[PDB]
Design a protein around this ligand. Structure first.
Ligand SMILES: [N]S(=O)(=O)[C][C][C][C][C][C]C1234B567B89%10B%11%12%13B85%14B%1158B%12%11%15B%139%12B%1061B%12%112C5%153B%14874
Ligand SMILES: [Zn+2]
Length: 257
């Protein structure tokens, strides 16, 4: 199966998922000087007050916290979006060292990690249906830099020892994702894709300008996870990021001057 290694990594994915070479792939480099300020973009509306987290899972490519998306409890609205998008899960991409790990880049700068909060458009009823639509998904992307600890991330970090290997999961109730957001909701937006197989071109990307800071001890715990199943040779889950893809005929828009 696909992965992030020499033999199965991003430059190989097009063989099983030919859309990898498509017209609206993600991530991209965000050239801050070429992004156009669009004064008609609305502020983003993040309503996570009623979010219900369920489980945390090592899926062999990242770890994810999954939410109850059977009602409008944690939704994303406004911004460049038409309609209501329910929060399904969040996960991260990170590096083997602090100088890489983010999928989006800003004027070619890589961050140590990138948080993706994945939402789907309720007009399509379910995520499987939504990934087949050009406005099916909205992913809120947040950069992580290394410095001060993020207190709101610690509950996550502390359970990772229990989901070390691919397929392990644990109960992960009462986690509040509001503790992962930066102060500002200023953002860049562009039409793109999933950054993992199946690389479906169904995503409105919303990438926040302001990074969150996490501690070296927090990111070090991400790097103790494993790509492999229990009983297989130990391969650390590091560098699980797709490089920037060609922008082609797309315009990146900014919410802010
Ligand atoms: N890195 S990122 O934020 O761009 C990743 C978002 C991927 C969200 C998952 C969507 C599906 B999973 B399950 B099936 B497999 B295929 B169908 B169903 B869920 B929807 C699709 B894949
Ligand atoms: Zn992601």
């Amino acid at each position: 199966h696909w992965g992030y290694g020499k033999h199965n990594g991003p430059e190989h994915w097009h063989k099983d998922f030919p859309i990898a070479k498509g017209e609206r792939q993600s991530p991209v480099d965000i050239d801050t000087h070429t992004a156009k300020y669009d004064p008609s973009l609305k502020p983003l509306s993040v309503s996570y007050d009623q979010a219900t987290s369920l489980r945390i899972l090592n899926n062999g490519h990242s770890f994810q916290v999954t939410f109850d998306d059977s009602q409008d409890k944690a939704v994303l609205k406004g911004g460049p979006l038409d309609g209501t998008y329910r929060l399904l899960q969040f996960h991260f991409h990170w590096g083997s060292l602090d100088g890489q790990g983010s999928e989006h880049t800003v004027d070619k700068k890589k961050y140590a990690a990138e948080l993706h909060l994945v939402h789907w458009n309720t007009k399509y009823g379910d995520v499987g249906k939504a990934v087949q639509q050009p406005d099916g998904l909205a992913v809120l992307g947040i950069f992580l830099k290394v410095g001060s600890a993020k207190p709101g991330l610690q509950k996550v970090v502390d359970v990772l020892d229990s989901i070390k290997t691919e397929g392990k999961s644990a109960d992960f109730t009462n986690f509040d994702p509001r503790g992962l957001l930066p102060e500002s909701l200023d953002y860049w937006t562009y039409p793109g894709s999933l950054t993992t197989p199946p690389l479906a071109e169904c995503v409105t990307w919303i990438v926040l300008k302001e990074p969150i800071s996490v501690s070296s001890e927090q990111v070090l715990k991400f790097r103790k996870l494993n790509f492999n199943g229990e009983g297989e040779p130990e391969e650390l889950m590091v560098d699980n990021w797709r490089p920037a893809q060609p922008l082609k005929n797309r315009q990146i828009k900014a919410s802010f001057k």
